[PDB]
């Protein structure tokens, strides 16, 4: 976790360490409770000692309310207040052993206690390598969510007074060791007050720091890029509550007539920008407008002002990765779309409104056999499509979303499979006939579909909605499932697995696809960065040329895997942290001894021990029948598909090995060269490789104004 | 495709009604053996395949 016992007062993640761990274990030996109830006995070994330790650290605060007391010369209890710093009192010394690290470092360590406690107390699966044997401290943006680098060219210790706007006082040099110390404590307090309910946790870490200075020299005598203090530039690492990133108004206290001290310090901290406003509720409250841009998250703008207003007036901020991929996101032709966020879903809601008026006008009419239910299954209906869907945007091949519709269980149906799918075409003929009869402002046509093999006579009904959208309609019946099963049963015995593959494609296209889009569309409103991480993953995967084999639901499942199981990390509060968590995981991931079980559940209906063991057992016999992954490479199993072979089927071994190799090359580049603009451009290079074949294709028109990006 | 699946349904229902009427009209054997049949079954191939699946 990166917690060595050096110091976090000097601006580095650490301070807590191994003998502090010893001291709290032996302090919890003789009690721990408020009545000194024995937290730790040596009746249980290191595993339950460790579990009780993490339980006590996660359920017993030290910073702000309560901390441990003990005296070595002798019970140990839990006193009630907190000293606004990590604290535990040892009265036989009168010392505060946890005052080597700071408030945010203790805060993030209590979070790590809670998180590893959550993934340790469960009796479901085993994750010992997930909890120990992966050094999460290797990368910055992997254990953190986003990063800023403050470059402060202060010049000299005397040039301070016109190069930086911070304090310079006896009262700060008496409590802070040096320049990096007072700027560190000032910058963590102004980041805390600037964001507050805008981020999960802040960690400050001055890089270029070193505890190294030679024999001949009196000090660190080092030109640290515009100063001579032991740090080069300031890592400002943020992990964010992702539900309030792009909320464009933060709120101070309201307006009394007597302008009290909280509104006072709010107006001092925010200067000319923030003011008191009316709202639709009618409250008169202190706030400030944050002009949201697409490429820029407003978290960078608020930290830019909280840097360039208080600690310096000419220092500058380095964060270019977010804007570097945010134009790799495709920007749709929408009104003020540059000022729209990436966490805005107004395009998907616009087609959902168009779909709902279509839904009403297809329910309010008369068939010879009424509608049981229609259910959209589209990638836009699960927030995944690469165009953020603008009306009239034909050039995207998934412009036409697909909606399954099923009538009621009439036992009048034709028998053989071509006849029943032709009867479904007959129903679609009737529905578009009445559609053009009554509401001719919608238009329509028919298109053959061959995404299922060997059924030659299956068409879909495509409609063009005058709000400007296009929907496929595929009729499902209660009969096609048992028709495919009895076709399986009476087929010739050397022709079984191909018809089984046909039925698997049918199940993936019609049946399990509905609960698929239902579950992850329901969970995307709890994991808010899901649609941007899948959209950037899919554009990465098409630049590296895999979508012609892999399916989009499989790419969607590989991208939900770091969200519904993010342990040991956080859920990703930013797009970069999501994307490199994806690629780090799939570079880690094997196939031969590695399935992929995920439960698409809400945080804090799940997958229990029995279903887990059944999934692992059919995986086990599946790939002892399959020796090394000759034709079955991945295994993605959810609650909605305990088979796991539904989306992984069909992809060739060169494509799957190319994906895993590209992931390992990407994590190699990440740990070697670091993040940069040319790093991200090399991460989106085609990797064309000149493997035997290159064609260059250009249709006689350009199609981005027509696709709407 | 209107007239196409019109002709397809118009031959399908013809051979279907013919098959079902042939099923439950009367089946005596070469000797006297009236065949047991369902109330609403439809094909000799259907009862053949279900008597195969109940092997």
């Amino acid at each position: 976790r990166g917690f060595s016992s050096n110091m976090s007062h000097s601006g580095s993640l650490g301070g807590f360490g191994t003998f502090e761990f010893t001291i709290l274990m032996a302090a919890l030996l003789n009690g721990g409770g408020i009545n000194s109830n024995k937290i730790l006995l040596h009746g249980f070994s290191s595993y339950q000692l460790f579990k009780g330790v993490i339980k006590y650290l996660a359920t017993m605060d030290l910073c702000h309310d309560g901390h441990l007391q003990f005296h070595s010369n002798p019970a140990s209890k839990y006193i009630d207040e907190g000293f606004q710093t990590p604290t535990l009192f040892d009265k036989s010394t009168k010392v505060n052993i946890l005052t080597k690290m700071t408030v945010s470092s203790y805060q993030i360590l209590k979070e790590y206690a809670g998180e590893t406690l959550r993934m340790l107390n469960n009796v479901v699966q085993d994750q010992f390598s997930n909890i120990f044997l992966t050094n999460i401290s290797r990368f910055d943006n992997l254990k953190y969510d986003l990063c800023y680098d403050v470059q402060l060219p202060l010049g000299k210790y005397n040039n301070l007074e016109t190069s930086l706007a911070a304090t310079f006082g006896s009262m700060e040099r008496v409590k802070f060791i040096t320049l990096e110390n007072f700027l560190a404590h000032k910058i963590t307090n102004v980041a805390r007050y600037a964001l507050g309910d805008r981020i999960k946790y802040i960690q400050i870490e001055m890089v270029g720091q070193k505890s190294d200075f030679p024999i001949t020299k009196r000090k660190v005598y080092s030109n640290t890029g515009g100063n001579h203090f032991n740090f080069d530039f300031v890592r400002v690492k943020l992990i964010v509550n992702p539900s309030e990133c792009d909320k464009l108004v933060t709120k101070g206290p309201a307006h009394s007539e007597t302008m009290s001290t909280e509104a006072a310090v709010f107006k001092n901290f925010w200067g000319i920008k923030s003011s008191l406003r009316r709202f639709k509720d009618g409250s008169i409250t202190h706030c400030c407008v944050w002009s949201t841009s697409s490429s820029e998250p407003i978290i960078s703008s608020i930290v830019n002002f909280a840097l360039q207003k208080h600690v310096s007036k000419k220092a500058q901020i380095s964060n270019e990765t977010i804007k570097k991929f945010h134009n790799f996101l495709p920007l749709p032709n929408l009104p003020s779309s540059a000022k729209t966020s990436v966490l805005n879903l107004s395009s998907f809601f616009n087609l959902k409104k168009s779909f709902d008026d279509l839904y009403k006008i297809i329910f309010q009419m008369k068939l010879p056999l009424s509608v049981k239910s229609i259910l959209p299954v589209g990638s836009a209906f699960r927030y995944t499509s690469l165009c953020q869907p603008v009306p009239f945007a034909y050039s995207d091949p998934d412009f036409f979303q697909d909606v399954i519709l099923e009538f009621e269980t009439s036992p009048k149906w034709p028998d053989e499979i071509t006849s029943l799918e032709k009867a479904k075409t007959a129903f679609l003929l009737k529905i578009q006939e009445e559609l053009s009869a009554n509401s001719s402002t919608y238009r329509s046509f028919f298109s053959r579909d061959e995404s299922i093999p060997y059924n030659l006579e299956i068409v879909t009904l495509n409609i063009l909605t005058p709000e400007g959208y296009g929907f496929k309609f595929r009729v499902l019946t209660e009969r096609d499932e048992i028709l495919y099963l009895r076709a399986i049963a009476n087929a010739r015995n050397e022709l079984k697995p191909e018809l089984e593959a046909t039925f698997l494609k049918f199940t993936a296209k019609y049946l399990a696809s509905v609960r698929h889009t239902r579950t992850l569309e329901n969970i995307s409103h709890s994991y808010q960065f899901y649609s941007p991480v899948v959209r950037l993953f899919k554009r990465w995967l098409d630049t590296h040329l895999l979508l012609g084999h892999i399916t989009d639901e499989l790419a969607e499942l590989i991208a939900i895997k770091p969200f519904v199981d993010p342990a040991p990390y956080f859920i990703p509060g930013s797009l970069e942290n999501g994307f490199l968590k994806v690629l780090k995981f799939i570079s880690q991931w094997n196939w031969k001894d590695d399935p992929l079980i995920l439960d698409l559940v809400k945080p804090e209906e799940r997958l229990t021990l029995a279903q887990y063991k059944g999934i692992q057992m059919n995986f086990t016999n599946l790939r002892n029948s399959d020796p090394n992954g000759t034709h079955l490479q991945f295994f993605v199993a959810s609650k909605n598909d305990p088979s796991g072979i539904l989306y992984s089927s069909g992809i060739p071994l060169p494509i799957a090995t190319r994906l895993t190799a590209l992931a390992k090359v990407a994590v190699n580049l990440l740990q070697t060269h670091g993040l940069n603009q040319q790093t991200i451009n090399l991460l989106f290079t085609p990797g064309l490789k000149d493997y035997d074949f290159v064609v260059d294709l250009r249709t006689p028109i350009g199609l981005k104004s027509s696709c709407g990006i | 495709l209107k007239e196409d699946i019109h002709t397809h349904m118009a031959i399908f229902e013809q051979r279907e009604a013919q098959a079902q009427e042939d099923v439950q009209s009367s089946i005596v054997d070469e000797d006297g053996f009236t065949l047991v049949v369902g109330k609403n079954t439809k094909s000799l191939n259907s009862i053949r395949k279900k008597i195969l699946n109940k092997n």
Partner: peptide, 10 residues
């Protein structure tokens, strides 16, 4: 009524 003849039997 070609489509009605196609949608008989139901």
């Amino acid at each position: 009524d070609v489509i009605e003849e196609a949608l008989s039997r139901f």
